[PDB]
Design an enzyme around this catalytic site. Structure first.
Site, PDB file in Angstrom:
ATOM      1  N   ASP A 154       0.848  -1.185   0.000  1.00 25.93           N
ATOM      2  CA  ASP A 154       0.000   0.000   0.000  1.00 25.93           C
ATOM      3  C   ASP A 154       0.886   1.239   0.000  1.00 25.93           C
ATOM      4  O   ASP A 154       1.657   1.453   0.942  1.00 25.93           O
ATOM      5  CB  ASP A 154      -0.936   0.005   1.209  1.00 25.93           C
ATOM      6  CG  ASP A 154      -1.991   1.090   1.126  1.00 25.93           C
ATOM      7  OD1 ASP A 154      -2.782   1.078   0.160  1.00 25.93           O
ATOM      8  OD2 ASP A 154      -2.029   1.955   2.026  1.00 25.93           O
ATOM      9  N   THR A 205      -4.477   8.808  -6.221  1.00 26.58           N
ATOM     10  CA  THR A 205      -3.551   9.524  -5.351  1.00 26.58           C
ATOM     11  C   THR A 205      -2.138   8.956  -5.418  1.00 26.58           C
ATOM     12  O   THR A 205      -1.325   9.218  -4.526  1.00 26.58           O
ATOM     13  CB  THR A 205      -4.059   9.510  -3.908  1.00 26.58           C
ATOM     14  OG1 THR A 205      -3.109  10.166  -3.059  1.00 26.58           O
ATOM     15  CG2 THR A 205      -4.257   8.079  -3.429  1.00 26.58           C
ATOM     16  N   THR A 206      -1.830   8.184  -6.454  1.00 25.51           N
ATOM     17  CA  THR A 206      -0.516   7.573  -6.616  1.00 25.51           C
ATOM     18  C   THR A 206       0.212   8.040  -7.866  1.00 25.51           C
ATOM     19  O   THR A 206       1.406   8.346  -7.799  1.00 25.51           O
ATOM     20  CB  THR A 206      -0.644   6.042  -6.647  1.00 25.51           C
ATOM     21  OG1 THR A 206      -1.361   5.597  -5.489  1.00 25.51           O
ATOM     22  CG2 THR A 206       0.731   5.389  -6.666  1.00 25.51           C
ATOM     23  N   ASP A 222     -16.094   0.983  -0.588  1.00 26.00           N
ATOM     24  CA  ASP A 222     -15.580   1.057  -1.952  1.00 26.00           C
ATOM     25  C   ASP A 222     -16.708   1.108  -2.976  1.00 26.00           C
ATOM     26  O   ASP A 222     -16.594   1.820  -3.982  1.00 26.00           O
ATOM     27  CB  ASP A 222     -14.615  -0.108  -2.225  1.00 26.00           C
ATOM     28  CG  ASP A 222     -15.285  -1.479  -2.188  1.00 26.00           C
ATOM     29  OD1 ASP A 222     -16.420  -1.635  -2.682  1.00 26.00           O
ATOM     30  OD2 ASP A 222     -14.658  -2.417  -1.655  1.00 26.00           O
TER      31      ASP A 222
HETATM   32  N1  LIG Z   1      -7.535  -5.744 -16.877  1.00 23.93           N
HETATM   33  C1  LIG Z   1      -6.829  -4.606 -17.079  1.00 23.93           C
HETATM   34  N2  LIG Z   1      -6.457  -4.226 -18.322  1.00 23.93           N
HETATM   35  C2  LIG Z   1      -5.756  -3.098 -18.537  1.00 23.93           C
HETATM   36  N3  LIG Z   1      -5.368  -2.261 -17.557  1.00 23.93           N
HETATM   37  C3  LIG Z   1      -5.673  -2.519 -16.262  1.00 23.93           C
HETATM   38  C4  LIG Z   1      -6.439  -3.735 -15.946  1.00 23.93           C
HETATM   39  N4  LIG Z   1      -6.602  -3.750 -14.611  1.00 23.93           N
HETATM   40  C5  LIG Z   1      -5.994  -2.642 -14.114  1.00 23.93           C
HETATM   41  N5  LIG Z   1      -5.441  -1.908 -15.098  1.00 23.93           N
HETATM   42  C6  LIG Z   1      -4.698  -0.636 -14.919  1.00 23.93           C
HETATM   43  O1  LIG Z   1      -4.019  -0.630 -13.662  1.00 23.93           O
HETATM   44  C7  LIG Z   1      -4.104   0.664 -13.061  1.00 23.93           C
HETATM   45  C8  LIG Z   1      -4.280   0.539 -11.552  1.00 23.93           C
HETATM   46  O2  LIG Z   1      -4.193   1.832 -10.955  1.00 23.93           O
HETATM   47  P1  LIG Z   1      -4.339   2.007  -9.361  1.00 23.93           P
HETATM   48  O3  LIG Z   1      -3.143   1.358  -8.705  1.00 23.93           O
HETATM   49  O4  LIG Z   1      -5.734   1.585  -8.967  1.00 23.93           O
HETATM   50  O5  LIG Z   1      -4.214   3.602  -9.171  1.00 23.93           O
HETATM   51  P2  LIG Z   1      -4.386   4.277  -7.718  1.00 23.93           P
HETATM   52  O6  LIG Z   1      -3.327   3.605  -6.877  1.00 23.93           O
HETATM   53  O7  LIG Z   1      -4.142   5.744  -7.971  1.00 23.93           O
HETATM   54  O8  LIG Z   1      -5.803   3.941  -7.322  1.00 23.93           O
HETATM   55  C9  LIG Z   1      -5.278   1.381 -13.708  1.00 23.93           C
HETATM   56  O9  LIG Z   1      -4.882   2.687 -14.136  1.00 23.93           O
HETATM   57  C10 LIG Z   1      -5.667   0.537 -14.906  1.00 23.93           C
HETATM   58  O10 LIG Z   1      -5.533   1.298 -16.110  1.00 23.93           O
END
Ligand SMILES: Nc1ncnc2c1ncn2[C@@H]1O[C@H](COP(=O)(O)OP(=O)(O)O)[C@@H](O)[C@H]1O
Ligand SMILES: Nc1ncnc2c1ncn2[C@@H]1O[C@H](COP(=O)(O)OP(=O)(O)O)[C@@H](O)[C@H]1O
Lengths: 507, 53, 517
Positions: free
Chosen positions: A43, A76-77, A374
């Site tokens: 995290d 936020t990342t 969520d």
């Molecule tokens: N099945 C998938 N196909 C393509 N891209 C994916 C898939 N699952 C997740 N992603 C990508 O992974 C990223 C995960 O970002 P995330 O870590 O949730 O950002 P944050 O930490 O800011 O919430 C997303 O931007 C998404 O585009």
């Protein structure tokens, strides 16, 4: 010109920490304790909160990220990564001649062009049916959670979101944080969670003597000004002897008689009281055709201030003739379970329903709480703007191509910083390819050569295999307001970090 | 050793999961039943005591 | 550790570090020149005279480097110097820019084979697109101003103050022999130094010119055969000392009479064999000049190794420094030898031109000996630039107006073919922006605004930054009507040699070991 370099150095150092924590296949960090402990987690927010730095820029970036996470809750990342990349690609290459003036205008023009490109690419959607919303919620929540009872939870969350909205007047204000809480009660079958009025009452009401049963009266709550005070504003009466204690009874009787002669026509019931309980005065109070409750915490205060609307002021008597208590409200003390429960239905300020779930231990409580949280966050982020964008790494390439085309067509003088800030948007696809485990050069070249034919802007990279696939067959979509907020926050952070001159000390 | 040779941990994890599934299937298919009586429990307790004391 | 003995720092990591930093440091001490500017550098080696130079040739000929990466470029520089006239710093600047732009590609994560292939493709495209910007051309080489303009343009790169008189003198000296058509030699023009007045009193003269006095008589006949010798007036009779004060006068008189009779017999045998004049290279004596005056024999005085070397390499004789009178075996082709009075000095003039292989010698004069070197350098550079071995030179607008056009053409061509070969093409296109930057940084203003202005006007290819103050910020001038052009084959050869050097440098790059004894 050495302060900006020292600032961007710390910025890049902070950004190069949680860079490999994006996507479904993310890594896991580990922090060691000075006493002899080690904790492994994946995290980024926990690592950012448990870190300790000394540079003002790092603290400002941490505060900005915390504010962005608290206001929205998603995105936020990548803001810090984008800010660090833009800094390292702009200031660490275009500051050899020292000219911090046109860079701000170039950043503003790039932000405006990105906003225009993201607005001229969105697709509309309908909110009439409910199956599409549930499918979108299930597709957006499939990240790193269990899958067994997610459908019922998401449906209950969608119902609560659609039922909690009532403050519409033209601005579309939605509040679910301080307007809908969660209740828990063990015992019974687990397949009965639903929505209810929700009253924060457990063991606060105490009735030593048996009186009449409460069916459907008219409860009118007052204020909390009947404790161990000295009166209204003078010190004429003080609780010190037994004579004063027995005169307090007559004083309260006279006060309730004055209240009845003033504004008591619907016959209220219980009243909020913080201090005042005995075995003789309480009997007289109950015989005076009135009831009183005690033991009020912060949850009960929030409930009576949100659902009922009780305020705090130095005015217990002489109120409004039609303040609160408008409608037939039932208050039957049910014996379902093992504690006293109240179901205040049909009263003032409706559309304030809470959840009702009967699980088991604390793990079920935590999992249903995080699921509701969520799901409500996803529903609020989706309903805020009926516009979806195909994510995964397809919109950034089109935005960069449009920016490059505009820069080549305008033929300006400050085209170098514009091109530098336009070519600094392919960090997310590169990180996804690196996390998947493939070549980051040939795949990037193929993605760049594919996003330039005719009508092709929905081809992204799969986050589980490592190949280029069209987004129209997978089902990866993101909201529109989140990307705009992320871009605006990144631009503001870059502008703030680029307008730093000298740093001194003072008081 | 495989990382020092040149590979990715994701493929190693996938292969380990596949091997675990294959071993579980083989153990489920190779199992056999036996009527519980007095000699079996005696032998089990004797083996446990030999491995302990 | 296993191969090197703690001498060099080579291995599997100096490919994108030590092998580029040396070339960068070598090229950094050269960007200060390149252009009409006053950046003189003093050279102190073994002459101990403290002289300032401007050209990079003499700077590189005196610097001693101990690195193979730096020695791999001096070979190409010498090859380019032997091939055409000018062209030296261009190859070094191009190689440095190519290395600095390939360092980033190597740090990103790309193999050297793809970069080499892209560089070769870009070089081939540039060589194919080069014959397309021909504007002016040579008309008739029998005129004066037509070649005088080119000579002035070539001299303006070196000297900025005086450049018209020297160009006119070089044109008059070149037009008095043979033009470019047919056959024209280079080692037939000599430069003499005269210590007298300034440079505002020079002239031209056809034939041999030598500053040699004459203490005999004017011999204007055709039978005066030359006879070169090493040191004929050295000392055939060695005399010693017997006592301390003086010896007997009889022995001294006898020795003097014997030496006089011997030298008289020697000069009689050397004059009766078919040689009226004699070239001496020693000292003089009273009886020697007396016999030379009474025998009608021209006697010289000034002696120099260069003079006798030129006389031997031109005529084809051989000096005979012998004591006994030899035979006449130095018969040449000269016959018409006249004397002239120039600057109150006696000079010789040889006439033996039969409308083929004519020679010329320009008369130069300056204040000190530290100022004629630059004049001679400019003269020989203009002479080498005049030789092109073609009737039509096909001049192109040089100075940086063609480099931007070539870079734009390469950039437009590279944005078509897909694959992993576009980065090398873009790097080769961006490397062409090193000539206007060095010319703008060596003037007094910046170079980014100049590049933006040159790229913002139009793609005509006839715009370049000037030299005056009213041409630095705008940099909008037409060099077609002014008379600033460059050699077509010279730039081609320079680009080819730079590409070859870059390929050789990028190829040999691994581990530098040693050799066993
Ligand atoms: N099945 C998938 N196909 C393509 N891209 C994916 C898939 N699952 C997740 N992603 C990508 O992974 C990223 C995960 O970002 P995330 O870590 O949730 O950002 P944050 O930490 O800011 O919430 C997303 O931007 C998404 O585009
Ligand atoms: N008067 C001038 N006007 C414009 N350009 C000039 C002038 N003099 C020299 N240059 C430019 O300077 C460059 C270097 O010239 P030069 O020193 O003769 O060759 P090199 O640098 O190879 O020794 C040439 O390419 C030429 O275009």
């Amino acid at each position: 010109r050495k302060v900006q370099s020292g600032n961007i150095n710390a910025a890049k150092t902070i950004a190069d920490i949680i860079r490999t924590c994006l996507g479904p296949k993310s890594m896991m960090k580990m922090l060691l304790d000075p006493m002899g402990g080690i904790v492994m987690t994946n995290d980024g927010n926990a690592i950012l909160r448990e870190i300790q730095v000394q540079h003002p820029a790092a603290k400002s970036m941490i505060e900005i990220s915390r504010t962005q996470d608290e206001e929205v809750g998603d995105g936020t990342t990548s803001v810090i990564i984008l800010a660090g990349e833009m800094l390292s690609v702009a200031e660490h290459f275009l500051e050899q001649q020292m000219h911090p003036t046109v860079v701000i205008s170039a950043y503003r023009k790039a932000l405006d062009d990105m906003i225009s490109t993201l607005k001229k690419i969105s697709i509309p959607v309908d909110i009439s049916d409910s199956d599409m919303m549930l499918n979108i919620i299930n597709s957006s929540i499939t990240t790193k959670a269990i899958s067994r009872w997610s459908s019922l939870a998401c449906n209950i969350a969608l119902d609560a979101v659609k039922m909690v909205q009532f403050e519409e007047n033209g601005r579309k204000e939605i509040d679910i944080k301080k307007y809908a809480r969660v209740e828990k009660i063990p015992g019974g079958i687990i397949e009965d969670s639903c929505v209810l009025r929700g009253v924060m009452i457990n063991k606060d009401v105490t009735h030593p003597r048996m009186r009449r049963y409460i069916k459907n009266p008219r409860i009118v709550l007052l204020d909390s000004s009947l404790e161990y005070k000295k009166g209204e504003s003078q010190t004429d009466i003080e609780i010190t002897r037994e004579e004063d204690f027995t005169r307090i009874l007559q004083m309260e009787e006279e006060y309730i008689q004055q209240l009845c002669e003033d504004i008591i026509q619907l016959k209220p019931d219980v009243v909020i009281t913080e201090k005042g309980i005995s075995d003789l005065a309480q009997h007289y109070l109950m015989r005076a055709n009135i009831t009183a409750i005690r033991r009020v915490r912060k949850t009960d205060n929030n409930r009576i201030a949100r659902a009922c609307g009780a305020r705090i002021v130095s005015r217990p008597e002489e109120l409004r003739e039609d303040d609160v208590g408008t409608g037939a409200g039932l208050l039957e003390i049910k014996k379902i379970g093992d504690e006293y429960f109240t179901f205040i239905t049909d009263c003032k300020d409706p559309k304030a329903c809470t959840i009702l779930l009967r699980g088991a231990s604390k793990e079920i409580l935590s999992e249903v709480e995080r699921n509701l949280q969520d799901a409500m966050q996803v529903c609020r982020n989706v309903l805020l703007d009926p516009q979806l964008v195909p994510g995964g790494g397809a919109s950034e390439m089109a935005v960069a191509h449009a920016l490059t085309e505009k820069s080549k067509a305008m033929t300006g003088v400050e085209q170098w910083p514009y091109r530098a800030v336009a070519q600094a948007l392919e960090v997310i696809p590169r990180t996804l390819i690196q996390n998947c485990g493939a070549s980051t050069i040939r795949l990037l070249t193929s993605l760049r050569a594919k996003h330039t034919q005719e009508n092709c802007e929905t081809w992204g990279v799969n986050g589980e295999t490592g190949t280029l696939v069209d987004m129209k067959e997978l089902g990866i979509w993101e909201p529109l307001a989140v990307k705009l907020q992320t871009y605006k926050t990144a631009v503001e952070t870059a502008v703030l970090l680029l307008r730093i001159d000298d740093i001194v000390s003072g008081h | 050793l495989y990382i020092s040779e040149g590979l990715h941990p994701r493929i190693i994890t996938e292969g380990f999961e596949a091997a675990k599934e294959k071993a579980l299937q083989f153990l489920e298919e190779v199992k056999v039943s036996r009527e519980m009586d007095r000699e079996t429990l005696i032998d089990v307790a004797r083996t446990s005591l030999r491995t302990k004391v | 550790m296993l191969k090197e003995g703690a001498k060099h720092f080579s291995g599997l990591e100096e490919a994108v570090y030590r092998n580029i930093q040396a070339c960068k440091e070598l090229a950094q001490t050269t960007r200060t020149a390149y252009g009409p500017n006053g950046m003189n550098k003093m050279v102190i080696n073994h002459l101990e005279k403290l002289f300032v130079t401007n050209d990079a040739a003499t700077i590189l000929r005196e610097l001693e480097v101990q690195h193979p990466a730096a020695k791999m470029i001096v070979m190409a520089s010498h090859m380019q110097e032997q091939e055409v006239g000018d062209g030296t710093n261009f190859v070094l600047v191009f190689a440095g820019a190519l290395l600095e732009l390939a360092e980033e590609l190597l740090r990103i994560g790309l193999s050297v084979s793809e970069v080499i292939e892209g560089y070769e493709i870009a070089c081939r495209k540039a060589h194919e697109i080069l014959p397309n910007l021909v504007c002016c051309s040579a008309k008739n080489l029998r005129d004066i101003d037509e070649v005088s303009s080119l000579l002035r343009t070539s001299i303006m790169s070196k000297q900025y103050g005086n450049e018209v008189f020297l160009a006119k003198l070089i044109a008059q000296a070149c037009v008095s022999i043979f033009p470019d058509s047919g056959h024209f030699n280079v080692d037939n023009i000599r430069v003499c130094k005269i210590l007298g007045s300034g440079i505002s009193s020079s002239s031209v003269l056809h034939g041999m010119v030598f500053k040699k006095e004459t203490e005999g008589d004017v011999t204007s006949v055709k039978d005066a055969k030359i006879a070169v010798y090493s040191c004929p007036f050295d000392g055939m009779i060695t005399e010693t000392k017997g006592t301390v004060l003086i010896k007997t006068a009889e022995e001294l008189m006898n020795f003097s009479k014997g030496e006089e009779n011997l030298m008289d017999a020697q000069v009689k045998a050397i004059a009766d064999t078919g040689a009226n004049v004699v070239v001496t290279g020693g000292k003089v004596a009273d009886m020697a000049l007396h016999y030379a005056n009474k025998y009608n024999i021209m006697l010289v005085r000034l002696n120099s190794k260069w003079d006798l070397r030129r006389l031997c390499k031109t005529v084809g004789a051989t000096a005979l420094p012998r004591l006994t009178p030899p035979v006449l075996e130095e018969m040449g082709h000269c016959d018409s030898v006249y004397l002239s009075e120039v600057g109150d000095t006696q000079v010789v003039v040889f006439k033996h031109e039969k409308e083929d292989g004519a020679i010329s010698t320009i008369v130069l004069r300056g204040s000190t000996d530290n100022l004629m070197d630059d004049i001679e350098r400019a003269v020989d550079d203009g002479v080498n630039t005049f030789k092109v071995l073609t009737r039509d030179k096909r001049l192109v607008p040089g100075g940086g107006a063609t480099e931007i056009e070539l870079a734009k053409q390469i950039t437009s061509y590279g944005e078509t073919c897909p694959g992993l070969e576009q980065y090398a093409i873009k790097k080769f296109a961006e490397a062409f922006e090193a000539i206007p930057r060095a010319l703008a940084e060596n003037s007094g203003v910046k170079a980014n605004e100049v590049i933006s202005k040159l790229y913002a006007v139009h793609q005509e290819g006839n715009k370049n930054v000037g030299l005056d103050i009213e041409a630095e910020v705008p940099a909008v001038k037409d060099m077609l009507e002014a008379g600033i052009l460059d050699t077509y084959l010279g730039k081609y050869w320079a680009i080819k040699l730079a590409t070859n050097a870059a390929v050789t440098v990028l190829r040999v790059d691994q581990i530098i070991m040693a050799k066993p004894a």
